[PDB]
């Protein structure tokens, strides 16, 4: 994707006016510096390769982390899947109105030892399970629930000490593109909820210890990483200025357009 | 001349004598839905002269301390003729538009407006916990107006109308990435924008989804000397283009 | 049993690798594609669109629409300055938050020419002439019109065409410059001065305004993608 190179320019005295235009048309000026001054011929070898939509977006970003403890009944984690709880991936995806990509999940699971009272605690490696429940399926209410059979729900088992687990998810959507903004309601009566939460029905993700609780408790944490692949993007959009406040909507408290200086001529 | 247009749609004509060019969309012109991209199976209706014509909205007064106005416009034409009657009897509908904002003044006045058409403009609420109600977001064929101050957080269901954040929590100078024009009273007299159908689905319900928003914001305020005409109005006429409807039922 | 030997870098998670991974939902049938208008393929065509710059950062105009309005009056002294700022497109708070300066804050290096368009939003009976200069570094900022005419300049005559483009060129020792404020890769200063006066008739207001726009030329380029310093978090958004 090589950029354009400048051509050699000469002194002109003519009726052609490349500098004078009309910005009221909604059209930006297509001038190069060889129209307003005398230039030399350079040949540029610079590329626009690292600014593509694929190169800008296809990096792994943390979206959530959840904890769960061994020595407890109902010690297991859940997460309703969205991309609107972190500050950095939310601002990158919201430069465009519509997106369409494949995913690449990666989980980073760690553990910590909790203050037991037995002498000589010695535990084996821990095995974890991460089950995905699509909207409508049965959810687990405890750790030794029947719902962890995973006859049709996809899950993954992983033992501590190895490489992190990793799957690949296609473009799952009802519509033709993922929507980052939605100016509308759920009900036809225009009551109730409003905004992007009406279109978020991606499912839930459950996490547990497969091992039994032996002699001391163990608290585990799992971090979730998203990576968009095969990206298409439509209708660009100005980047977010104010800080984010909530997850379900675009509420903000107002802020100035830049920071201030002391004068108009100060440098 | 490059400063004259004439736009004919249905039984209506718009003439202008000072203008910039017309801005067409993202480069594409409004057309009908093809057989490759359709999903609904029954036959659409296409009236195409009873609905595709210029409807003129209410006029607003450009005062000296004005901040801006907005319309939504699937909703602004919900009571306008046989366009608004086809929206009531049908479940789906898709359409493109052509928007003609017009504002004249003499050679002795000054000012500048930004006329931008944004898709999927989620507005923000003044209270950070709620979402705004419907009557705060849009009135039918009547403008909702920005403010040069901040709405307090004691207002439960109200739109945050601080104009420099454009209602969306964003830079108001960066709104020139959507299709836009300027009305500079020194040079210009009207702005014309031709918008295609932009959505993520091939058809949509026209009553619970506004997929456009027209904003008119004075970047340079109105000013004149004593003796000149103090009343300067702004008028907006919108004509649908290539409109069709599926899912005929009762009237709602 | 084919004999293999695992190298360093095994069982690591580098967040910018390109490997194949097994699909969790096999033989899933995706929704067919649609033609949506306005497909963006490269971020360098977002940065090539004009956006208004807030030159008037004066400690109470930033939370207002007065940040974008450059005041211009009918003077009585010759060669007065209008504005002036250093050309740091991602470090100076004039060009920091624009549509070009917001893209530069995701990257580390930048290279190319920069357009600056100025629109005269005054009365139709007002005349005037301005000087739009650009000074490469090495000396200070120009303090006179005589110092500023020695650099790259254009002389703008207002009239029917209400806009004028000052195109600053790429004059640099290195192929790239740093987005962050570095003294080794300084870029210079952009100033504006009165050439002649703003002359208005009777019953016309003598105070006008100018809007300024910025974009990138067709040889602009960015490099070394990083994270923006503008967004921030303490707890989870919920």
């Amino acid at each position: 994707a090589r950029v354009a190179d400048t051509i050699s320019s000469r002194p002109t005295n003519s009726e052609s006016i490349p500098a004078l235009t009309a910005a009221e048309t909604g059209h930006t000026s297509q001038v190069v510096p060889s129209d307003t001054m005398q230039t030399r011929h350079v040949k540029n070898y610079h590329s626009r390769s690292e600014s593509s939509i694929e190169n800008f977006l296809c990096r792994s970003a943390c979206v959530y982390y959840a904890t769960y403890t061994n020595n407890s009944k109902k010690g297991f984690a859940e997460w309703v899947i969205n991309t609107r709880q972190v500050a950095q991936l939310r601002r990158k995806l919201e430069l465009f109105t519509y997106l369409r990509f494949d995913l690449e999940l990666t989980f980073v699971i760690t553990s910590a030892q909790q203050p037991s009272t037995a002498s000589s605690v010695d535990a084996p490696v821990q095995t974890h399970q991460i089950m995905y429940v699509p909207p409508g399926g049965p959810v687990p209410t405890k750790v030794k629930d029947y719902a962890w059979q995973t006859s049709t729900n996809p899950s993954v088992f992983w033992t501590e000490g190895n490489a992190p687990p990793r799957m690949s998810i296609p473009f799952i959507s009802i519509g033709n593109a993922y929507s980052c903004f939605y100016d509308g309601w759920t009900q036809f009566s225009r009551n109730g909820v409003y905004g992007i939460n009406t279109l978020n029905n991606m499912g839930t993700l459950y996490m547990r210890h497969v091992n039994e609780a032996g002699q001391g408790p163990i608290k585990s944490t799992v971090r979730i990483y998203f990576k968009p692949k095969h990206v298409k993007a439509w209708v660009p959009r100005p980047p977010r200025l104010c800080q984010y406040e909530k997850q379900k909507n675009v509420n903000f408290s107002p802020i100035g357009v830049t920071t201030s200086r002391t004068d108009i001529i100060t440098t | 001349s490059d400063r004259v247009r004439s736009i004919t749609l249905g039984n209506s004509t718009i003439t202008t004598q000072e203008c910039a060019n017309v801005v067409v969309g993202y480069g594409v012109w409004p057309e009908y839905l093809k057989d490759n991209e359709a999903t609904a199976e029954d036959q659409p209706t296409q009236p195409d002269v009873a609905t595709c014509r210029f409807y003129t909205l209410e006029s607003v007064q450009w005062m000296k301390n004005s901040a801006g106005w907005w319309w939504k416009l699937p909703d602004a034409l919900s009571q306008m003729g046989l366009f608004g009657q086809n929206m009531q009897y049908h479940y789906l509908g898709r359409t493109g538009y052509t928007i003609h904002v017009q504002c004249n003044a003499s050679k002795f006045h000054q000012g500048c407006l930004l006329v931008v058409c944004v898709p999927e403009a989620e507005m923000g609420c003044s209270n950070l916990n709620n979402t705004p109600e419907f009557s705060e977001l849009s009135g039918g064929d009547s403008a909702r107006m920005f403010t040069d101050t901040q709405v307090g957080e004691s207002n439960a269901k109200k739109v945050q109308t601080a104009v420099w954040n454009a209602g969306m929590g964003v830079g108001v100078g960066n709104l020139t990435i959507f299709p836009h024009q300027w009305i500079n009273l020194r040079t210009n007299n009207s702005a014309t924008l031709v918008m295609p159908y932009i959505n993520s689905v091939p058809m949509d319900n026209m009553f619970r989804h506004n997929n456009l928003t027209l904003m008119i914001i004075p970047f340079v305020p109105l000013n004149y000397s004593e003796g000149s005409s103090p009343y300067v109005p702004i008028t907006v006429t919108i004509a649908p283009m290539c409109a069709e409807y599926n899912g005929l039922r009762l009237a709602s | 049993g084919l004999p293999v030997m695992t190298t360093p870098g095994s069982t690591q998670f580098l967040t910018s690798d390109d490997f194949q991974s097994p699909s969790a939902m096999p033989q899933f049938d995706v929704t067919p594609e649609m033609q949506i208008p306005g497909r963006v393929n490269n971020l360098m065509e977002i940065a090539e669109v004009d956006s208004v710059v807030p030159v008037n950062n004066t400690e109470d105009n930033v939370s207002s629409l007065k940040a974008y309005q450059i005041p211009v009056q009918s003077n009585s002294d010759n060669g007065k300055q209008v504005f002036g700022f250093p050309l740091q497109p991602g470090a100076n708070n004039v060009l920091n938050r624009t549509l070009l300066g917001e893209i530069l804050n995701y990257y580390t290096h930048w290279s190319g020419s920069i357009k600056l368009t100025f629109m005269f939003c005054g009365s139709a009976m007002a005349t005037g002439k301005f000087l739009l200069a650009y000074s490469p570094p090495g000396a200070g900022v120009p303090k006179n019109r005589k110092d500023a005419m020695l650099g790259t300049h254009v002389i703008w005559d207002v009239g029917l065409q209400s806009s004028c483009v000052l195109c600053v060129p790429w004059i640099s020792q290195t192929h790239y410059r740093y987005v962050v404020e570095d003294e080794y890769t300084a870029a210079g200063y952009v100033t504006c001065w009165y050439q002649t006066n703003i002359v208005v008739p009777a019953d016309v207001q003598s105070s006008c305004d100018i809007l300024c726009f910025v974009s990138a030329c067709n040889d602009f380029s960015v490099r070394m993608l990083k994270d923006t310093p503008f967004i921030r978090q303490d707890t989870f958004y919920q």
Partner: antibody
Amino acid sequence: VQLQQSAAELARPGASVKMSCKASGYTFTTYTMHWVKQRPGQGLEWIGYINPSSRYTEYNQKFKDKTTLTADKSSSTAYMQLSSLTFEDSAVYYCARRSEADRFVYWGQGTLVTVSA
Amino acid sequence: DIQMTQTKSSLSASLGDRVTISCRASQDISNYLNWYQQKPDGSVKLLIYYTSTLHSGVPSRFSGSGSGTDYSLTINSLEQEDIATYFCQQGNTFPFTFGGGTKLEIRR
């Protein structure tokens, strides 16, 4: 990354008094600055806030006619002025910085105000 | 206003025991509750910024629970650095209202 307040102050009934809360470690004009009152026999009590970017203040209904919030971007402090002091207005006043929607992550150390003669 | 009430105002237990502080709202605040801890020298810090989500740097003895109107805070192993005053705060309605205090002490 901390917030630093003024020292303890003492005023006559009917007089006025002005606190301060100097912020450091972050950009002062990005977050609002809230003020909380704690009388020693009761719980905490919200007073109001100020947006340092636009100098916009909003108050509680009990504290609207007395308190006056102000700020300055240069020294990056936030002041608070109590006027027409009574014996009820003797408490410990905190400054807090609000993040997200309803969360105060960073607090001050508090200034003690006593109204006597 | 939504009145938050903690009916205890004083609680006593031995070290190594499990304590439970409860805060009750006026109407439904919909899981927008926060818990703060005021040390005896006057410093306040945020512990749990939702019904049950711990702030960073907080030890894992602390745990939050509840739904609707009635809520809870649990310290499952009381230490000497946990003797303080604890406040609840709703974030649902203007203005922000804090609950009364609840002070901890030693049983004997």
